[PDB]
Amino acid sequence: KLTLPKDFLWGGAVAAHQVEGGWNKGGKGPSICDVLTGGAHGVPREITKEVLPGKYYPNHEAVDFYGHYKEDIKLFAEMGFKCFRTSIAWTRIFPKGDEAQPNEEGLKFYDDMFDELLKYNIEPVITLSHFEMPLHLVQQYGSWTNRKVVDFFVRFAEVVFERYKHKVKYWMTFNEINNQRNWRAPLFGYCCSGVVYTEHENPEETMYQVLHHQFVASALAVKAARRINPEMKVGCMLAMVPLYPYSCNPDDVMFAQESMRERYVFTDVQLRGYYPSYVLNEWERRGFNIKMEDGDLDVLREGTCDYLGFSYYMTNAVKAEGGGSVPNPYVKASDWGWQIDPVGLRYALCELYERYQRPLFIVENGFGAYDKVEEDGSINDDYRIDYLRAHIEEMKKAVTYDGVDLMGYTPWGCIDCVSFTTGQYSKRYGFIYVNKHDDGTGDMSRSRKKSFNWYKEVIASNGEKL
Amino acid sequence: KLTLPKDFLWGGAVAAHQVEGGWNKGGKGPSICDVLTGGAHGVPREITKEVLPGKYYPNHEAVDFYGHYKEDIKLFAEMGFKCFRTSIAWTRIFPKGDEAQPNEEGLKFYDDMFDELLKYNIEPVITLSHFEMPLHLVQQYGSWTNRKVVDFFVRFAEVVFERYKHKVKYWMTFNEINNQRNWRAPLFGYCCSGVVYTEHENPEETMYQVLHHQFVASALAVKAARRINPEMKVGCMLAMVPLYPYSCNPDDVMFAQESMRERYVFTDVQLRGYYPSYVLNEWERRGFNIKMEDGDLDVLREGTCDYLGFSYYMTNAVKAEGSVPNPYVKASDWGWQIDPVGLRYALCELYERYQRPLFIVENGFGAYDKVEEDGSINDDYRIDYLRAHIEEMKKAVTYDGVDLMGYTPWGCIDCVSFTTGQYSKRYGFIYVNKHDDGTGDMSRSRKKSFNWYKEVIASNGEKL
Ligand SMILES: [Br-]
Ligand SMILES: [Br-]
Ligand SMILES: [Br-]
Ligand SMILES: [Br-]
Ligand SMILES: [Br-]
Ligand SMILES: [Br-]
Ligand SMILES: [Br-]
Ligand SMILES: [Br-]
Ligand SMILES: [Br-]
Ligand SMILES: [Br-]
């Protein structure tokens, strides 16, 4: 029969600010999430002006990957990871973002991390910006609204490409860059770009300006990496939630088609190297005015990403008249309402590959669920195994049947991490359980869930034994 | 205030074999359609070994565009056509297909037609192969299944490319090349490529072999046109029936996505320049062996088409052919579902996929026409259809930002139908007095849609 490529990149994914902790160790400056309080169901996270002693900030400690990384990596090697995806904490390299020189201690930290990873033959996959820019850049410059932040990010990228030019083969620029396309939401704009759009006179115009600065920063980074070491691959990162039309009503089919542009505009620019006519038309209609410098458009054409990294978790259904979507009655969903749609993965893979004809990378996938530690210490997470297995099956299909070019697969929060929306521990994704809880209890120790040995066998059989 | 481009190519579209007549005049040899009998509802058209006396062949006479072209064109100009789409009858240039020299008479005929068109500032849009290849190539060489036909087709393209290099700006290689992807249907394979696939031991493998030859031929033709006059645009021609997932069931959605590849594989090759991985995978699955020659893949990459010409009439909904009636749309009396939004959808999908200029080379409403006592034909129904479609078309261009060259409604002058070869199913703004029973005098007259469309062009789409 046919199987995945022998060198398929099976691994695991996390983000610095979601696991590391040590938020103020080694000279690291505060990031936008270090002033983001923990939340819960019905209780949103709060942005504070500074770190308030009375408040709870879950990213400060997270799961202490900063201290446990050597041992955690030994666990990754036990599962047999071919690669590991995390981010380089921007604030560990430029604590404020505008320093004349980088923070040496930060650079050493990641030298050590990548060394361990390579010791076990684990290829680092690094996201340059993953919801954790320096607070100072937001407070002093107005964040990505300011062209200067472009320069700051490029300096950051330049320093790290060179430092780890022989240690890191795979890069991505801006994590889930399209989350913020939803500009009414309280935290997509903030975590993406340190900008809350509804707090501006022209929220949408402000959005497109930030996007432009980031597209240009991404393109400038690609070129930088090419000059430093053209063997390295730098991809974009798209949060891929496919939108099904609820029915075969032409209005529904057409609404979904136009709505998918909220995703595609980002890859269109980052992969094709220019603003697609459909977005330029919108700017006209809305009378937006996006400040560009001479050369920007050239920069975009010359610095398109090399591969399409994306996260997949779920699918949505949309109606032309109604809502801003509606639950798909043909699929089940997690305890947090995230729809379970493995076929949607094959759909996303086929759609993305047919549109761009460039290599794809599934850099996020996983099932957020509660875990119960049994009397004997085991954690039976068959619910998570069922999810991942169904997705891997569909993923395999898109590769061996549909002919999609797929680089690899890295399930999200491969070790339990602080959640994004609520900053809780209780919503778990990991193969490795971390003893840390919402009320602050726990000793931070690790233990293997049932999904641990299962995913081990997955990689050993190159995805043939599920 | 936004509108279509000032130079939008409004026009009309027909096919040589469906309008011309004079099937054996001017040295013209018999085509595959010259042996295709007329039919009707529940009575399939028949292919005969040769021209049989007691048999009816609608394409022999058609509507006599051969004799009426000058006067017909005058009617085109009256509506104010910016362009006119037709095909060059392969058999008027190479009557049997394998002649070393072209038929001068055939060439002069199109010099005359093109001269008339250009007399009225009408830009010819010429389809090289439109369901009318030389019978002889089919009988003697086994048609497109034979590699020799590639060179025959290219010889043909080269002759006409050179002859009209200062008269024709817009070409297309193969008309609705994807119709034959439905290898079971009795006519698509035969009309597209003179091959009935079910009559072969490996229908599908035979099909992909035919397609490879035509993909190469198309590319070779594009390369040939570039050398002759790089200002000429050579496009492809896809029959576009969007497939909607019946419901948001992931299985319907996925099924629809994969099914659309039956369209996209053709434009993928002709526009992107190579065989998409998904079809190459199907071949390995099925064990097919498509015979290729060194440089073929090079040819495909070098001779991609400039623009995507396509036809649109309808959409289908699919459930995991797998079709099911779409409960949200109406249909013509011939079952063709009416879905103007589908056009906009087709334009956006095609454009977002290839980012190449599009060209709506066919769109129409086939229906009965009644002549009123005073000679007038009230075809409100046809106008209704055309208007709804033009409106969504305008949205795709001015709202969505699709790059669109023009728009030429099908059978702009009444023509012989494809499926049945009848006159009764009319598409035109111009009525032709000729009927299924053979009665009529071939005279032309204007339908209500004549002046309506006349105003569409004058207002560049702003007065509908
Ligand atoms: Br505060
Ligand atoms: Br400094
Ligand atoms: Br907990
Ligand atoms: Br013969
Ligand atoms: Br048929
Ligand atoms: Br077969
Ligand atoms: Br080759
Ligand atoms: Br189909
Ligand atoms: Br509009
Ligand atoms: Br009739």
Residue numbers in the entry:
A (entry chain C): 5 to 327, 337 to 479
B (entry chain D): 5 to 324, 336 to 479
Publication passage describing the model:
These novel structures represent enzymes involved in stress response, specifically methylglyoxal reductase (YghZ), as well as three enzymes important in core metabolic functions, phosphoglucose isomerase (pGI), 6-phospho-beta-glucosidase (BglA), and glutamate dehydrogenase (GDH). All the proteins are oligomeric (YghZ, pGI, BglA, GDH) and belong to three different fold families. YghZ and BglA have a classic TIM barrel structure, pGI adopts an alpha/beta fold, and GDH possesses a core Rossmann fold found in many nucleotide binding proteins. Based on these experiments, we demonstrate successful structural characterization of multiple proteins using only microgram quantities of purified material.
6-phospho-beta-glucosidase (BglA), is a cytoplasmic enzyme and part of the glycosal hydrolase family that is able to hydrolyse aromatic β-glucoside phosphates into glucose-6-phosphate and a hydroxyl aromatic in vitro. E. coli has several predicted enzymes in this family, whose physiological role has not been fully described. BglA forms an 8-strand alpha/beta TIM barrel with the putative catalytic residues Glu180 and Glu377 located in beta strands 4 and 7. Additional density was noted in the active site and a sulfate molecule from the crystallization conditions was well ordered adjacent to the putative catalytic residues Glu180 and Glu377 and formed hydrogen bonding interactions with Thr434 and Trp425. Modeling glucose-6-phosphate into the active site based on the position of the sulfate molecule revealed residues likely involved in substrate positioning.
